[PDB]
Amino acid sequence: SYDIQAWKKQCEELLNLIFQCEDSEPFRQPVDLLEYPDYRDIIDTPMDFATVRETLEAGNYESPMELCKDVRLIFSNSKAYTPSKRSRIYSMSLRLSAFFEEHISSVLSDYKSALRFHKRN
Numbered sequence: 001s002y003d004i005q006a007w008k009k010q011c012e013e014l015l016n017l018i019f020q021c022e023d024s025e026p027f028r029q030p031v032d033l034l035e036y037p038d039y040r041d042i043i044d045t046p047m048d049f050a051t052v053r054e055t056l057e058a059g060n061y062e063s064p065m066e067l068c069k070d071v072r073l074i075f076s077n078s079k080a081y082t083p084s085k086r087s088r089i090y091s092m093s094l095r096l097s098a099f100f101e102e103h104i105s106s107v108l109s110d111y112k113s114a115l116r117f118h119k120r121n
């Protein structure tokens with residue numbers, strides 16, 4: 001399976017599944033700075049799934065590793081902002097992270113395999 005471009009639609013489909021997950025609700029749009037006026041004191045680089053989808057659709061990711069770095073930032077920002085590891089939003093983040101990591105592993109493996117095949121000779 002040596003298609004160098006296949007990751008893009010695989011990531012589109014995975015984002016569609018994440019948007020259907022009730023657990024993505026806190027993370028579908030940029031964090032509410034009116035509700036959380038201290039947010040930017042703690043979070044240097046806000047990230048959300050709508051920003052990830054728009055970056056993908058703009059053609060502004062070169063690899064699935066770059067998309068994976070932005071998705072992981074959503075999960076670290078939620079951890080950086082939680083007052084407790086027993087919070088509803090952080091708890092949703094941990095389940096969604098597990099789901100994402102389970103699904104992204106084959107996308108990354110296939111892509112890196114395809115690049116190695118392209119450079120084989």
Ligand SMILES: O=C(Nc1ccccc1)N1CCN(C(=O)c2ccco2)CC1
Pocket residue numbers: 025026027029030031032035036077078079081082083087089090
């Ligand atoms: O406002 C948010 N997101 C939103 C929701 C609806 C509309 C616009 C934006 N948030 C709150 C801050 N976040 C946290 O990860 C967190 C952990 C503990 C408390 O919040 C991210 C989601």
